[PDB]
Amino acid sequence: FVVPDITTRKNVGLSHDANDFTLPQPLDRYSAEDHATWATLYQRQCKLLPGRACDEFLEGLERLEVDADRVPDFNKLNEKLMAATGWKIVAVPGLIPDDVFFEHLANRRFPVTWWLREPPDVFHALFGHVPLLINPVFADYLEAYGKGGVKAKALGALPMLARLYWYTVEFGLINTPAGMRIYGAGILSSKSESIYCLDSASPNRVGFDLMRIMNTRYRIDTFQKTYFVIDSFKQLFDATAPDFAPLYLQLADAQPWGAGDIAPDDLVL
Ligand SMILES: [Co+2]
């Protein structure tokens, strides 16, 4: 039997732009259970993350006044976000087309799935991704990433950019004099990956390298076998400076590294 998935069920009776896939945040659809689920997840992560999350993340939560006790009102969060970096969040139904996603980031709009899991959803999107948008360097990296979507799509290279996003925005680590810390949203909203990614001898931790990352496969249904480590958000933004076109064409005929591989030139940490 095939039954409707959560995206389908949550969006019953709602609409989305056929081009940019946005909708007004459906505030009336959040139940008491939803706000309680949000509060539980928020409390859980805030207990786990001190000394694991990078300091910029935890500061972003406070500066944006991300609600501890209910699903945040997107309009209200946008007041603080816009004043900080000129970014805003927009509600989407769930997974959206790539050109749409990129066009949003290119225009300093961060798409956020509106609905919450039952006890990627709004907790992952808002709690995991949004706090770093208050950091001007990180925000500029995301904008530059978004702007690269047009060229990538024209060259059939969206999956190569997707690897860069996965291994930075979703699963990135940042080294600090106080020790290794986390900036990837997929780790920051996770119950357990926050522990494994810093505490386990199992995963590789490899210095950030643009070409290497864009040549590296990933899997979505398991903890990462490799994490890439930056020294600063400036490293990410600076990585977007050169022309990616000749990089895509070189990668196109290469054999990608497996998710668990160490490459001969890796700086292994
Ligand atoms: Co994500």
From Swiss-Prot:
One of its GO terms (biological process) is L-phenylalanine catabolic process. Its cofactor is Fe(2+). Fe cation binds at H124, H129, E170. It catalyses: (6R)-L-erythro-5,6,7,8-tetrahydrobiopterin + L-phenylalanine + O2 = (4aS,6R)-4a-hydroxy-L-erythro-5,6,7,8-tetrahydrobiopterin + L-tyrosine. CDD domains: pro_PheOH. Its EC number is 1.14.16.1. Keywords: Iron, Metal-binding, Monooxygenase, Oxidoreductase, Phenylalanine catabolism. It is an enzyme of class 1 (oxidoreductase). Pathway: Amino-acid degradation; L-phenylalanine degradation; acetoacetate and fumarate from L-phenylalanine: step 1/6. SUPFAM superfamilies: Aromatic aminoacid monoxygenases, catalytic and oligomerization domains. Disulfide bonds: none annotated. Gene3D superfamilies: Aromatic amino acid hydroxylase. GO terms for molecular function: iron ion binding; phenylalanine 4-monooxygenase activity. Belongs to the biopterin-dependent aromatic amino acid hydroxylase family. PANTHER family: AROMATIC AMINO ACID HYDROXYLASE, PHENYLALANINE-4-HYDROXYLASE. Monomer. This is Phenylalanine-4-hydroxylase.
